[PDB]
Amino acid sequence: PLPWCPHLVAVCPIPAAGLDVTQPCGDCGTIQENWVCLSCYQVYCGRYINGHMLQHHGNSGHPLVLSYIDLSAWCYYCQAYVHHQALLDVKNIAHQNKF
Ligand SMILES: CNC(=O)Cn1c(CCC(=O)O)nc2ccccc2c1=O
Ligand SMILES: [Zn+2]
Ligand SMILES: [Zn+2]
Ligand SMILES: [Zn+2]
Numbered sequence: 265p266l267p268w269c270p271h272l273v274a275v276c277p278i279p280a281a282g283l284d285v286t287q288p289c290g291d292c293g294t295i296q297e298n299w300v301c302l303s304c305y306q307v308y309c310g311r312y313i314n315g316h317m318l319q320h321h322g323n324s325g326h327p328l329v330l331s332y333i334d335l336s337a338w339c340y341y342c343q344a345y346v347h348h349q350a351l352l353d354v355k356n357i358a359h360q361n362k363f
Contacts, residue, residue, distance in 0.1 A: 265345035271327030291316040
C-alpha cells in the first residue's frame with residue numbers, strides 16, 4: 265500500500281464502543297462486504313454490493329474507509345490503499361473484534 269497519504273489527518277478517534285465488524289450497511293442492511301468510515305465510523309457496503317460507502321464518500325467527502333473483509337484501508341481521493349502507524353489502533357481493534 266502507500267505508506268502515507270495527505271488524508272490521514274481526517275482519521276478520527278475510535279469510538280469507546282469499539283467496532284462491530286458484523287455491523288450491516290447503514291443504508292441497505294446488507295451483511296456483505298461492509299466498510300467503516302474512519303472519519304465518522306458509519307458502516308456502508310462496498311462497491312461490488314450496492315456502493316453505499318462510495319455514496320457516503322460522495323456526500324461527506326470523508327477520505328479513508330476500512331474493509332471488514334481484510335482490514336485494508338482505502339483512500340477514495342488517492343484511489344489507493346494506505347497503511348501507516350496512524351491506522352494501527354483501528355486495525356488492531358477491528359482484528360480483535362473479527363478474530
Ligand atoms: C476490493 N477493494 C476495493 O474495491 C477498493 N476500492 C474501493 C473500496 C471501497 C468501496 O468499495 O467503496 N473503492 C473504489 C471506488 C472506486 C474505484 C475503485 C475502488 C477500489 O478499488
Ligand atoms: Zn448498502
Ligand atoms: Zn464518513
Ligand atoms: Zn489520500
